[PDB]
Amino acid sequence: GPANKVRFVTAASLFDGHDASINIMRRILQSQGCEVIHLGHNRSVQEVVTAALQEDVQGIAISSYQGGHVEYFKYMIDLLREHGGEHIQVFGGGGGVIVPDEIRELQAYGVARIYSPEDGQRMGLAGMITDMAQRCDIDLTRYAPTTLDTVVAGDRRALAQLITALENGKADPELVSALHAQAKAAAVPVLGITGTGGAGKSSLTDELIRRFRLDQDDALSIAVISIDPSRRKSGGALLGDRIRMNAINHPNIFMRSLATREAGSEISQALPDVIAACKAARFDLVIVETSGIGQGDAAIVPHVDLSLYVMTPEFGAASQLEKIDMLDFADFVAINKFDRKGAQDAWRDVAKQVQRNREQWHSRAEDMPVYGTQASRFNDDGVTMLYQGLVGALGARGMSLKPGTLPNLEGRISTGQNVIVPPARSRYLAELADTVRAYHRRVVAQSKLARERQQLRAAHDMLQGAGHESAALETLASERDVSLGAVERKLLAMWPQMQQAYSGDEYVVKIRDKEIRTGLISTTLSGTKIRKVVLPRFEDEGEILKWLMRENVPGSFPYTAGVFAFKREGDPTRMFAGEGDAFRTNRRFKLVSEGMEAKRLSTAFDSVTLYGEDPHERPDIYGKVGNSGVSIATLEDMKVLYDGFDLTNPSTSVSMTINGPAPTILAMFMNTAIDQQIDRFRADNGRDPTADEEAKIRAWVLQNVRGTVQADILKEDQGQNTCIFSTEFSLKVMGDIQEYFVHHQVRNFYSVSISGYHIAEAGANPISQLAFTLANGFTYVEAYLARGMHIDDFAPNLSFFFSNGMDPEYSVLGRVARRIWAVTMRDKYGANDRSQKLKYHIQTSGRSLHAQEIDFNDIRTTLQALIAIYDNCNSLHTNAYDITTPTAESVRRALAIQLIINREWGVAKCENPNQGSFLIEELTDLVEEAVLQEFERIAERGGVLGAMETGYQRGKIQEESLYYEQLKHDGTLPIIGVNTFRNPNGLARSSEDEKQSQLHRLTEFHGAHQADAEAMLARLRQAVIDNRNVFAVLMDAVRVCSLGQITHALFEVGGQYRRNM
Amino acid sequence: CKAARFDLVIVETSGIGQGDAAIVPHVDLSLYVMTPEFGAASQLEKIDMLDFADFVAINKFDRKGAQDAWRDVAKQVQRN
Amino acid sequence: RTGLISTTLSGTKIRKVVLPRFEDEGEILKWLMRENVPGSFPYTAGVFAFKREGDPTRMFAGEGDAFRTNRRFKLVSE
């Protein structure tokens, strides 16, 4: 029970994906009656400190679930003691990450308060909350400014103390009326923004602020005040509107979040005084967001100079406008979230209604200053049109403003252009599932017809063999012969030869002009001859054809037995290695790639690079520099990293793991590949290669461009929820660079990486993982199809990665996926078979893999590998902790297992370990049906776009985790070594000097490009404004810009993700 | 209405806001009507009358997301 | 009466033994003559039609004199 209004802040550290615990914590806090401004996850320390200082909050709540917090705590304490934040309480708690030794270190350091897991369990959360709240009983009235110097200068701390005085009424009322007089002499613009809270008005304000920043060159002093209703029961409120604001990145731009603090009134009673304070604070513009509005309230309109109303297409009947007197006084009206149906009709109706109200029959209703807009889509045309209309109104309102530097885009309606998804394309998933059903139906029908024909045939033969002359038999047989389908009859016709061709001990293939004859006989120690693939030996043809249609031989559509007709011959020991600087990594490569014919390198990076984070003098990342991955600053670092390794060699394979800035790294890789050849030719000639030599190098690189990239932006959004770029724009860039590749006929490189590894590690049931992956891949196909690209051109290069768990579902799941994939390619699009064949990678179980009794987990992994061997996996992966070092002991065990599979298993010499079992096919079909059902469920939910928009997969993983953990705790789930058979008896760091050297290299790169930095910025902005294929611009910018600069520019353009959910 | 020996009395409220719950003490039971479109789920913290509505109805079940709306609102009132 | 349905974590119904669903009867008879259900002649699929339900910890134990062996059994067969 605080005497005053207490303000608290909860937030998560940078690079944090898990915030549900802090979410429930903040729920309890606001339930207690605490006013909290939460900033979500991955928030800059400087940004959070600035926000807290400008908002003048009383307490700070911290949840540190990822470690490394100590730097942030120390820096924040130093800054608070530096900027008068010692009296502002700071509280933290992050579970068991803080070791009790670390707890003692923090306590002796001088931390305000750290909550131990033992303390959290014993004392309880409510008691701690009450203790803190009663502890925050501090008087801020002594902090109120006594003079007018701070107010005139614009000290927003002084203005916040003034707001507190207004709340307490302790301000000198004569001084307040004098402030009103000063505002009357000032008269700076005040914009009233009216509409429902959280509808997207924050995104609109963010985009408009960004537009004004770019047009007027960051020259606007913007003061923002938000008033929100107070929960009459609790008395507190969560000021969750500043959180969506991200374009406030300017010291002279200020924002304040406030409550109504009135039991009956929905607005603050001192709001005009706040307006006068902002006007006298020498702010070039004041923007106000209203609270939850009713029907006939129009109190804010006379208190502001311009009125802006926010509306949505959903408003009920058109007669609901007959009761909105607020709209009778709204100077500007905008229809928010134009993505829903009927929006254009409603716009026409409202325009007609306004025309009737104003009796302006001589004017055009569509020309009225009311626009329909969709806030979620970036670069919205209606947003630019409304900004232009606002500029025109300000000119009409007599606003001395700098001339517009932006092109004058015409119109009044956002057209939804650059919409990757075709609006109608959507329910494609149900279409595909129905196609699968129809394929099954047709297969059954054809099998039945062919069986009937065969039965009639043999019956006639026996009867004609019995001597009886019956002409009805041949007529009836012919009735089925024409009924028999042509393609099936062709497949029916092929049975005798292939049956005989594979009956022998050796298969011969005269390929092109040469011949490929390979023996088919395998011999055991007892001398028994083993055919590698043995076919069913049935007599009746109906079931034969049914099998063939449903299950062909390997290498035959739909490649159910695998894509490759015969097993690959052969040690693809993947060389995954990377840490520290270039020198250590190159030494390690020399260790691994010493005298190796085929270079198969796998490259990992630190999250700082994986997040595209520029190295910074802030210690927040300093402990993370060179940790768990190589931090790259410039192209030369990569070129040195690739010194002495002939990447143009066809046996040289490199697999790098990054998703977001991956095109930038690929551009750098192209630079390195070209530079190697150019420098070699220059040394070979003692002269610079000419433009003809440049074109020759270009064509040669296009010929020999080979590589693998582990990029998947989507999966970060599914499990980390840390994505920063709009996935729409990211996939647009993906399409642009893919278009470059097609235009450049890139044929040997691989950049797409679709996986379920984090999906599987999330605890996702395999069926859902499969279905979601299929949806994502086919939506990618549609997007590329929405790009007007031939399906067959890029499908062969499309890649997949899977993780294999324990359930009996995993037994055939890969085969089912292969079977459905081919028919999806064939029926819907009919791309060439080379596109229809699937390539994939398989990973063992990681979710069931645990340090708790890993010894038996190894034997479980044996079972895991069993199926993938029977499933004939083309690529098997065993997870590496690279956390503890992935020691060579595990690799020794895994390679031993692989060799045992390859040789020691005689059953492995067969190539059809699963064909025949009725259990197998029944499991297959039931799994098929279940996957279809899930597809229909997601298709019925508004497609992948809606499922991601609302968080469908979030609920999926939540339910799966809850059910699994309940089975685990109940003991119903039997677990070896945990729930059963209990035991009767029972870190790489880089020197800071290396980081400083790399930082010096990067700054020298900046110093090499500081004079030409303006040219690079202009080039970037030219790429930005036209919304073209940026990679063309990126091809040269990478040579003159660091990746951190690129990310900064991408965030500056407005591509930053706003936590608006 | 009560003294007129009327067996059941029905009242339709006028325009409402976020926190006003004035009619609830003036009535024996409380009923609210809502629609599937709700913007963010945080707006439930704005509806103080939701903490006191004896009954709630989600009109126009036709729009998408209404079922997940049921799930989330049911969880929210469960926590309430 | 013994249930034939088995349930997995995903709730999938599993029949412990599933016969072929062939259409022709000749190959059906061929199989039945060559392979019957468990508990049917010639019991290729095992004598017991249904799997034994159950802890076969065989106590292999003997060494030394009678007294030491009996103490060992006391340890094992307590």
Residue numbers in the entry:
A (entry chain B): 22 to 591, 593 to 904, 907 to 1010, 1019 to 1093
B (entry chain C): 299 to 378
C (entry chain A): 538 to 591, 593 to 616
Provide the authors' own sentences about this structure as they appear in the paper.
Here, we show that the G-protein domain in a fused system forms a similar active conformation, requiring IcmF oligomerization.
With 500 μM of the nonhydrolyzable GTP analog, GMPPCP, long chains of IcmF protomers are observed, with all visible IcmF protomers comprising these filamentous-like chains. To further investigate the structures of IcmF’s supramolecular complexes, we prepared cryogenic EM grids and collected datasets of C. metallidurans wt IcmF with GMPPCP and butyryl-CoA (wt IcmF + GMPPCP) and Q341A IcmF with GTP (Q341A IcmF + GTP). For the wt IcmF + GMPPCP dataset, the supramolecular complexes were first manually picked on the micrographs, extracted using helical parameters, and processed as a single particle dataset. Signal subtraction was utilized to remove the extra density that was due to the extraction of single particles from a continuous helical particle. Local B factor postprocessing was performed to yield a 6.7-Å resolution reconstruction. The G-protein domain interface adopts the same conformation as observed for MeaB in the GMPPCP-MeaB:MCMCbl complex structure. In terms of maturation, the formation of the supramolecular complexes made up of apo-IcmF molecules with GMPPCP (right) invokes an assembly line model in which a chain of open mutases can be filled in succession by an ATR that moves down the chain, delivering AdoCbl as it is synthesized.
